[PDB]
Amino acid sequence: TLRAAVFDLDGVLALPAVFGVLGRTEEALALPRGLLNDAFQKGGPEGATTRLMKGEITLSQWIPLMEENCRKCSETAKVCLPKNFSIKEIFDKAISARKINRPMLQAALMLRKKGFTTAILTNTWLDDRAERDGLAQLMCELKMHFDFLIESCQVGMVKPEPQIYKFLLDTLKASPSEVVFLDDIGANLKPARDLGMVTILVQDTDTALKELEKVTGIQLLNTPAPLPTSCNPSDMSHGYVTVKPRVRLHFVELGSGPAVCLCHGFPESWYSWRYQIPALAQAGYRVLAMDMKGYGESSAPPEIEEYCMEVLCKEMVTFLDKLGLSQAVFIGHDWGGMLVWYMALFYPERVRAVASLNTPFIPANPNMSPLESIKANPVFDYQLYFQEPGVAEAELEQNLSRTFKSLFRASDESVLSMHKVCEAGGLFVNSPEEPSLSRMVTEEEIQFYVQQFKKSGFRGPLNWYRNMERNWKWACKSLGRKILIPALMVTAEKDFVLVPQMSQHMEDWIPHLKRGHIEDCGHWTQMDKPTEVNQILIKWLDSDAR
Amino acid sequence: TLRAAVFDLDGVLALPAVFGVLGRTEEALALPRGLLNDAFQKGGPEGATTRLMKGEITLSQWIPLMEENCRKCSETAKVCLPKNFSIKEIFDKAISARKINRPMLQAALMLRKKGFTTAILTNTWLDDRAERDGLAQLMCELKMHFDFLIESCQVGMVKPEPQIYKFLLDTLKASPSEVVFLDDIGANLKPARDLGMVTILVQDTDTALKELEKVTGIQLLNTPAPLPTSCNPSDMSHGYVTVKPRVRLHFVELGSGPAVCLCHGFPESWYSWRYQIPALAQAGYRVLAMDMKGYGESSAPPEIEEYCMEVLCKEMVTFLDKLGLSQAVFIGHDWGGMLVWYMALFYPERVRAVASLNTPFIPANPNMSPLESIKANPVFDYQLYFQEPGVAEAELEQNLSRTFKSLFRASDESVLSMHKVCEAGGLFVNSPEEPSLSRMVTEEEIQFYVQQFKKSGFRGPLNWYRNMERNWKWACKSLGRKILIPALMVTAEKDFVLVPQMSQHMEDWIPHLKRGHIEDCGHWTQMDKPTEVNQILIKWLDSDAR
Ligand SMILES: FC(F)(F)c1cccc(-c2[nH]ncc2-c2ccncc2)c1
Numbered sequence A, B: 001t002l003r004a005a006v007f008d009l010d011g012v013l014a015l016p017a018v019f020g021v022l023g024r025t026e027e028a029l030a031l032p033r034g035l036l037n038d039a040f041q042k043g044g045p046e047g048a049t050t051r052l053m054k055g056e057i058t059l060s061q062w063i064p065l066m067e068e069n070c071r072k073c074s075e076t077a078k079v080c081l082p083k084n085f086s087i088k089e090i091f092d093k094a095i096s097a098r099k100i101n102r103p104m105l106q107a108a109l110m111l112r113k114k115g116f117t118t119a120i121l122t123n124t125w126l127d128d129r130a131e132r133d134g135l136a137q138l139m140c141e142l143k144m145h146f147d148f149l150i151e152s153c154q155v156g157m158v159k160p161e162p163q164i165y166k167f168l169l170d171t172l173k174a175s176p177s178e179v180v181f182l183d184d185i186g187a188n189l190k191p192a193r194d195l196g197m198v199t200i201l202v203q204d205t206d207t208a209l210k211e212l213e214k215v216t217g218i219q220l221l222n223t224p225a226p227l228p229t230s231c232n233p234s235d236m237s238h239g240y241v242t243v244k245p246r247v248r249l250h251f252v253e254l255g256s257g258p259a260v261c262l263c264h265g266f267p268e269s270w271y272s273w274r275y276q277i278p279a280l281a282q283a284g285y286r287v288l289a290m291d292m293k294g295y296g297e298s299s300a301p302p303e304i305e306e307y308c309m310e311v312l313c314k315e316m317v318t319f320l321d322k323l324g325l326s327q328a329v330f331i332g333h334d335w336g337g338m339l340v341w342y343m344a345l346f347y348p349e350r351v352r353a354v355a356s357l358n359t360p361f362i363p364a365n366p367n368m369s370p371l372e373s374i375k376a377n378p379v380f381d382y383q384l385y386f387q388e389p390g391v392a393e394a395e396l397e398q399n400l401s402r403t404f405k406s407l408f409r410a411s412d413e414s415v416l417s418m419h420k421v422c423e424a425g426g427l428f429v430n431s432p433e434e435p436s437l438s439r440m441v442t443e444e445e446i447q448f449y450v451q452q453f454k455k456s457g458f459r460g461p462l463n464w465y466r467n468m469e470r471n472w473k474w475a476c477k478s479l480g481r482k483i484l485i486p487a488l489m490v491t492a493e494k495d496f497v498l499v500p501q502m503s504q505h506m507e508d509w510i511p512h513l514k515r516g517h518i519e520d521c522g523h524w525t526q527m528d529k530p531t532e533v534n535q536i537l538i539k540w541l542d543s544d545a546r
């Protein structure tokens, strides 16, 4: 019974095969068939390529030995290599051309999701080329999805030597009959087969995947579109910055490139961005996913005034000062979306670009009290219920698991009416004791919010709603300004409080505003529609946030 | 009696003054004298510039109002503005041309070092230009050195209005006679003077500094060269990555740009790089200053084998994997210098560039046991003393303050002979109970090492020396390789163990090696000669590490 799947890198998890380029090159240059492929394997186990693959020498040391071999092979063939013929250039192009074979990776992900131990076993080299980073990036992205990465040049062994297969089985802690081994090289398949492992000769991915599906009994082809990569909290880099004596901010950090600061809503976490963090880092950005003040590992002081927009924004500026960042792109959702508009209005020099999910930008009405303004819209009754200190804390903290299960639902699953909350006497008065689990979340993900909320509770988070007059007076100072830095407004069709039509006048104060729109999407935008949020953010970041 | 110094930004802490550009422009374009300067101040307190300075409008909103004003001023003058005349371009160039007035900053640093409360009071704007980052960077660098930054556009008040001076005095919690106020605008000096504050009209810096020196009684001119900026541990961003179940790595993080991973020696800390961290971040790099395994906030497992080079290097690769970094430049000192050469030899694809302070690269001798090799050099006797588990721990842990005070000394201060340590029976047998404090360190800095070493002690750190045979067998696998990635070897003239001549054969295995050499420098390179280390590293990073 199968419990492990092993994949070759070249010609299997990555395409086009770097090997096929020696053939592609012979044809393009009208050189004798197999000439370059023969100089590549010259001397077999004693040869230059085997020393390279075993890690005896680096790729840069190997280049002149391959050129030497290419000339000896051409001499014997009674042919000539052209003037400008470069092995370096041939391999630079080949490696740079090789991309992840997405459906093969998807199959490995599915097998691992179904309990399989997965591994990459590859004959590879120690890359010291000036352009080594592209391959390093590829290996980084690929390896995260597997339990093991076994590279020939690191283990000093090579396929097809039988020791590498015995090394593979020992790392897997599995007997050969429990293992599927996928390879594009028949000679490299034989020792695994000779040992009793299930082997797959990979020519085209589809047939290989049909064979893999047949042998595992797991559907891998014609599968529904998968969710983006998520985050395992214990596998992240956790950051901590003291912004003032009693206040520290926590964040999760992934990737390199322009700083992208993710600002969650109520009652959330850095973990609300779980589906965006790996995708944005993969797109070339340094992601800083915050635990906003009052949440998770960030400080939660009790005072209401510690949560007014002026203070929260000043502290976010200090956060950047302490990390030595002159700028960051600011992406917010719900309450974080509102903070992000105020960061753009008050600190445009610190904001590279600004994006909001659901939260529109609406200027303060100087001729109406913010309390009057909230009362005018029936769907904002929940914010009036949030005013009195202790009332919403008591209900929200009564049963954490019920709180998160009732809140975090897709638009078609909603257990809560946002209408007449005060009159009802609470958010959950017409809600079950044991809500069913939404299709958006697992039990484990609910328990992460439950565990995070056990530290400080709902007081600090609820305090974000308790500064309406303070925020209105501050916001009124910005009434003559416009947002002229790059900006994105993303609307959610089925957010019945932050309705798409609420954002309709935004180009009056943000003329160059860019937009995104998500169909059949509720309030919990990031987990409701992760694939579309990722597509909208990556597209905007690459075009407008450099 | 003076206790506060206040500085204007334009024409005082930053030069050339952005104001002077309107004059420079009139002359270059042969326009009527004071024409542009007049359109700049048009309408006075009611005018466009005052609204800009109070934060009513942004810089981008102000540009067309200034152009409108420039045309009204030119009309009245019976002159014409040329075809291609752009206010945007004039201010883009001016702001971009304005740099920190280094000796004025040096004086403020000196006054603050002498107990003064320092502040920047400036009439500034909300910058939303596409090129706003340059000014954001300038403000970031400048503000860190002061207790307060008061910006007109943030406080809604402007100089010379008297409310801004009353606001300044309230933030300072000081009466006017206790305050020096430096400004280049006489009209802006008057209200501070009228209040009883000591005022300095700043034309040329030297005279202003002579006046400041006269009035404070503190030497600010002709001062000895200052040390680079240091780090305050509680003001840094602290990072934590779990590399395996029982092992977590701690780091300090500052700046943006290519990742630069700093690897300390024995018995050190991330804090050994205190003088390099602000300088390298300021030069355009993202600095990751490690607490190496066994130190500070990083895990310190007891097992000797947890500290062999193969394991330490694998964990540093995992560290990069978890932070989502495909590469980092690796800079090491002492034991960290040795790790950094092995990172280049075993993982060149993960190493952007490699630099070592003091530690040379010497290949393993396959025909001699590493123990025999250590015995061959008299100055390496301390490593033999470090072999037996518990002996060096007991001595090193007996009195922490004495340990760090005895170790951390300049070449001319040394209390320890590195000769016949085993025979003597310890490192400190001929050392005082209460060593004097070295000129390289303060009491406070010694106490930081003392506090860090109280957690795990010396076992994990000493274990780095306890894998000589394991490291030799691993290193022997790399005997056919060369280091062909960018590399820097920095030697310290007076390191009497890691002597400069020990690095003499390095170009045999690193042909493109670049070098640095520090005169009159002991073992503790980073704190012994911080200014020169910074100059050598920044120069090499900008030329070779992109
Ligand atoms: F705690 C509250 F009040 F439920 C809360 C808090 C924050 C946002 C929202 C929200 N905004 N838009 C839609 C929703 C929503 C509707 C139905 N179920 C859950 C959420 C509601």
Ligand SMILES: FC(F)(F)c1cccc(-c2[nH]ncc2-c2ccncc2)c1
Binding pocket: B266, B267, B334, B382, B406, B407, B408, B409, B414, B415, B416, B417, B418, B427, B495, B496, B497, B498, B523
């Ligand atoms: F603990 C030890 F053994 F002192 C130790 C540990 C690590 C490095 C060094 C070292 N390397 N080069 C010079 C020195 C040195 C010489 C004189 N005083 C202090 C240090 C010494």
